[PDB]
Every structure is written in C-alpha cells, then in structure tokens.
C-alpha cells in the first residue's frame, strides 16, 4: 500500500534525475553539427537480380558471410538457400511448421536456423556427411511465438520470442544458457554487435534494451518511439543502432550518449517500418515500409536519397551483404529483389 | 577452368532437381486452403474441431483439403502474430451467444479484425456455438439482455429470419439480435471485398464442415467474380 506508493515516487524521482542528466549533456543536435557536410546526392539503385521460387509471402532472409549465398524463409513452409550470383538455389529445406517468422545463416555457413509460431527454433545442418540437410536440434524453451534468431557461434545461437524474453542457447546441450527478461511487451527483433559480446533488442513497447551476453542483465534502456518497434539494426562501428517502428519513423540511438540522434521521418509517410539495415560504411540506412516500397536515408543529414520500388506487396525483410556490395529486399509478393 | 565449369554444371543440375521438387510442392500447396480458427476461452472452438504454439488440423470434404488451425500457444496480445494470416481463405471466428457479459468483447474483437489493414480482404465465417444454452437461459429468464444492450428493448425480429418451427419467439429474437449486431458491425465498413457468414451452432451439430465448405466456395467464387470485373 504505502510502501508501493513510496517506491513508485522514488522511481519517478530517479527517472526525473535520469532525464535531467540526459538533457544536461545534450549540447547540440547532430542536425546542427552536420551543417558543414555536403549532401550525398541521389542514389539510383536498380533491380540487378529477381529471385522467384517462393509460393507465399517472404517474411525473413539473411545474407551469408561470403556475400554470395543467402537464405530466405517463406510462410508456405519453405526455407530456400540461394546463390545470389547465378540466381540458382542450392538447397530447399521444407520446414515442419509453415508459419515461420525468422531465419538465420551461421557465420561459418555450416548450419541454418529458423523458427516461427511453433515456439521452437529449428536448426538444420547443411554440410552433412550424407549430403542431405537434416534437423540437428530443436530448441523448445520459449512460450510464445519466436520472432528472431541470430547465430553467435556454431553452438551459441541467441533467440527472441514474442513473450517478453530473449534466450541465449547452447545447441550442443539444447538448453538455455542464459535468459534475458525485462521487456514489457512482445519482443520483435534483435541485433548483435560486431564483437558479439553484447546485443540490442527491440520490443512492442516503444523501447529498446542493450543486453550483455555474458552478464545476462539489462544494461541500458532507450525509449524514444511512440509505437511498436518492428526492426532494429547496428551501425557498422557498433557504438550506435537504428530502430524502425510502426508509427512511421526511424530513430538513431547511441549507447554512449544515451540519446536519439536522428528522427528519420517525413510528413508524407504514415506507414510503419518493417525492416531496417545499414550500409557497409554506415552512410545509407535502408528501411522498408508498409507503403509497398523501400526508402534510403542519409545516416547523417536525415534527408531521403533514393527510393526502391517494384514490390507488389509490403516489404518485410531487408539485408545488406557483409562486403556492402548488394542489398536484398523481400516482400509479401513472394519475390526477392537484389539491388546494387 | 574445367573444374569451375563442372561446378556450374553440378549447380545447375541441383537447381533443376530442386525446381522439379518445388513444382511438385507448388501443385500440392495451391490445392489446399488455410483457415485461421480463433475465439475465446469460453467460445468452445475446440468442440468444432472434429479431427506447442499452433494446434493444427487437416480435414477433407468433397476431395477438397481444408487446413484449419487453432492458436493457443501465445498470449492474449495478438496484434503482431495475426498479420501472418493475411493470406488465408477465411477467418473462422467462434463465439458463444450465451454469456452476454462476454459478448461486447467479442464484438470489439470482430470489429478490430474487420477493420484491419492486412485482414481487410479476408472474409469471416462467424460461428455461434452455444445456441442451446442461450435458449435455456432465455427460457429461464433470470438474465435480461437489455441490461447489457439497451437497444434490444426496441428490436423486432427481421422478416427474413427463418426460425426453426417449434422454438420460442423470444429465443428467436435474441438469436437474431446477436446475429444482427455482428452483421451491422460487419457491413458498417465492408466495401464488398470481404464478407461475414454467421451460423447458429450447437455442441452436437454434425454438419459443421459442409457449412465451412459452402462458405469458402462462396468466398472464392465472389473473389473470382470481382477479379474478372464481373460482380
């Protein structure tokens, strides 16, 4: 009763102190400091490749570390690995559950993970002695739809599921090494830092959290959006990240400054972002939208520079290669474009 | 370069065999219809199913394979995992017409499903699963619907209504009042792309599959007619 009210008052006072400390160090806006740099111009990307082998809407894809092979999951119960150079398809893995919401390609290229509404993260071995692709593990520790999964090693995948928790897994044993909790609502996406010692996670409560993999504790919390956060990604240097929400705006948060640097938004766009990604140099932030086409923002002046098109349905998944050569865009029309 | 050429030759052979497999998978997949089946805890939707995160079920009628499924593994918040069902043939919405206290929530859920950007095309098959309990409750008369719906006091049974011969006209009035509430929520915004197909269902009805068959046939027929600029 009274103790709860006193605790709430103390928490509110501490939050006010945090806000005051945050605003004290807000010297000048990056829009102001960037007055001395020149605009990037007008990027004109064209559809270099069109991959068409999926029956239903493409909901996720992931590029390989070789910048040539990619994996794409579709809601028809299919997980196709494509060679982006020759348009050929190396593997076509039929999933147990049709409703798959994410997929991941191992950094070594040996295993491929997927997982959707079945609450389980399935892992498939590509380079088997028999030459076939078979299920090597089935991680079944989540109670809620599995929204994201990313490989940290060949045995240490990390998973985000729509039950306000993320789990650090150990594929060999098949059990959760560490469990991260603290999100108010369903968690939508996660992104790993280049050093992979810590990652960020965006959830459906207009908040993002920085998780230390080793410690397994909530390190930092960023709250700058107004609606559900649908996508998250790292800046290439790993000291900043970008979030894309359903209220038709993208934001850039810095782990050190604890502030939102850019609010990439326009008055003419009232469609939520579904996927974000950065370029190799960190100058171009690509972002899919509900308005059926992607946008390209300059990551320092917030001015839109270049617009992708040619997708019959909404853009769901977006990925830039490890060498920054091409960008692959999937959409709910079951076609995957490759631009460069 | 002979090794390289052999590499592309093997890759093209693998692509050809995988393409044959994908053609077979397409011919299998396009011949089945997916149905998102949802309701409430007291709805009794599990009773309609006459066979982890999804309780799947296949049934077949007139050589047509319907692919129905319940979603019970997730929490009550459903604004993110429901978009995944924007391509189903129909949405089977089950609700009990006996507990008036939990009927406004069902009306709100139906309205939210109806006026959704990604579900704006999917038509809804509405099931009222507790007709016998509703009839018994009305016959008892201890609970009054007007306590939860003040507009029921001035409601008249529609002329187009077709009550089963031998039932209480009060029960008929209650049934068609609930059905007309759902139907006005439906037609308030539906601009001819998706439709609502209410039905009156008990817990012992053995004709709950032909109804879904006929409703899906009508849905896809209207879809084709609209596609050919012929509606």
């Amino acid at each position, epitope marked *: 009763q009274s103790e709860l009210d006193q605790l709430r008052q103390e928490a509110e006072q501490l939050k006010n102190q945090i806000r005051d400390a945050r605003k004290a160090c807000a010297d000048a806006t990056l829009s102001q400091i960037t007055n001395n740099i020149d605009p990037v111009g007008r990027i004109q990307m064209r559809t270099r490749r069109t991959l068409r082998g999926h029956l239903a809407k493409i909901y996720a894809m992931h590029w390989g570390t070789d910048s040539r092979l990619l994996v794409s999951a579709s809601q028809d119960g299919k997980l196709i690995i494509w060679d982006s150079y020759t348009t050929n398809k190396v593997h076509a893995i039929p999933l147990r559950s049709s409703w798959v919401m994410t997929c991941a390609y191992a950094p070594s290229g040996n295993y491929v993970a997927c997982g959707g509404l079945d609450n389980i993260c399935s892992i498939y071995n590509l380079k088997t002695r028999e030459g076939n692709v078979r299920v090597s593990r089935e991680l079944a520790g989540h109670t809620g739809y599995l929204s994201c999964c990313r490989f940290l090693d060949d045995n240490q995948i990390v998973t985000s599921s729509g039950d306000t928790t993320c789990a650090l897994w150990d594929i060999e044993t098949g059990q959760q090494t560490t469990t991260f909790t603290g999100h108010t*609502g369903d968690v939508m996406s996660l992104s790993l830092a280049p050093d992979t010692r810590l990652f960020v996670s965006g959830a459906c409560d207009a*908040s993002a959290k920085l998780w230390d993999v080793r410690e397994g504790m909530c390190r930092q919390t960023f709250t700058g959006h107004e609606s559900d956060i649908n996508a998250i990604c790292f800046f290439p240097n790993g000291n900043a990240f970008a979030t894309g929400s359903d209220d038709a705006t993208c934001r850039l948060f810095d782990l050190r400054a604890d502030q939102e640097l850019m609010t990439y938004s326009h008055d003419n766009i009232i469609c939520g972002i579904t996927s974000v990604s950065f370029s190799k140099s960190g100058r171009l932030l690509l972002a899919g939208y509900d308005d059926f086409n992607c946008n390209v923002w300059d990551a320092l002046k917030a001015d839109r520079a270049g617009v992708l098109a040619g997708h019959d349905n909404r853009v769901s998944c977006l990925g830039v290669t490890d060498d920054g050569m091409a960008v692959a865009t999937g959409s709910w029309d079951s076609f995957l474009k490759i631009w460069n | 370069t002979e090794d390289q050429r052999n590499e592309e030759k093997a890759q093209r052979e693998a692509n050809k065999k995988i393409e044959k497999q994908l053609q077979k998978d397409k011919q299998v997949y396009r011949a089945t219809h997916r149905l998102l089946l949802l309701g409430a805890d007291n709805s009794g939707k599990s009773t309609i199913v006459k066979q982890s995160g999804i309780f799947e079920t296949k049934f077949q009628v007139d050589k047509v394979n319907f692919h129905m499924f319940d979603v019970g593994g997730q929490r009550d918040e459903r604004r993110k995992w429901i978009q995944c069902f924007n391509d189903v043939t129909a949405i089977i919405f089950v609700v009990d017409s006996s507990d008036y206290n939990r009927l406004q*929530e069902a009306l709100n859920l139906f309205k939210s499903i109806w006026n959704n950007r990604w579900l704006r095309t999917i038509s809804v098959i509405l099931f009222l699963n507790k007709q016998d309990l509703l009839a018994e409750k009305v016959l008892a008369g201890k609970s009054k619907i007007e306590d939860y719906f003040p507009e029921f006091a001035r409601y008249t049974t529609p002329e187009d209504a077709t009550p089963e011969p031998g039932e209480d006209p009060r029960v008929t009035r209650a049934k068609y009042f609930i059905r007309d509430e759902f139907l006005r929520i439906s037609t308030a915004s539906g601009d001819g792309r998706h439709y609502c197909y209410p039905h009156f269902t008990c817990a012992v009805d053995t004709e709950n599959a032909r109804r879904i068959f006929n409703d899906c046939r009508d849905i896809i027929q209207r879809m084709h007619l609209r596609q050919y600029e012929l509606l």
Partner: nanobody
Amino acid sequence: QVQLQESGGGLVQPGGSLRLSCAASGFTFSNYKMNWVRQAPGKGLEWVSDISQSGASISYTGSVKGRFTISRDNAKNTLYLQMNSLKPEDTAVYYCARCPAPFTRDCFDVTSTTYAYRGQGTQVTVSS
C-alpha cells in the same frame, strides 16, 4: 516515453457524478484513438467507451450507454469521461488505454492483461 496519467475521484454516493481526466504525453494525441477500460474488483478488464481521432465516431458499451460521456481535447492533449447516475456495479479501477497504431479505424488488443500503452489507473468507488 509514452505515459498516460489518470485523475478521477474517491468515494461517491449512488446516483452521483464524477469526471475522470486522462493526461497523455509522449506521443501525438490527435493521431491516436483513445479508449476507456475498467477492471472491476474480482473481475477482468473490460471495455467501456472509445473516441476516434477527431471525435466524430463516439461509441460506448451497452451497460454504460446513456450515462457516461467521453470527449477528447486535442489542444491540451487530454481525455475526459463524465459519469452520471452511478450504479453500485460501477465501482472499479478505470484505465485510460490508448491505441497501438495510429491512423487505424480499428483499435486492437486493448483489454489485454499486460498492455504497454495503458495508464496506472484510478479507483472509482461507489457505496453508501
């Protein structure tokens, strides 16, 4: 950060009136459709009334139809619910939940047990 602060009243007599206010901050009020929900003691969360972005599409639940009035003031970024002729069943905790996505005619998953865009609530108690 999105926050919704509710300010109502305490104990009222049956048949009385009470005006609940809801101060919303952290988001563009005019783009979101506001809702009023309530949780009765020993009962789940239920929906009472809702107001559109402008206020042209008003709706109420049946049990509250004809007694409560909902109205939004976008200039001051606030919401109001006037309650008249209160019944003993009307005692509850009133939550001023806002809507997940803007520019949408249907507001979805509002009466959830755990909902992010919802206030701490205010207790309305009616008795003798």
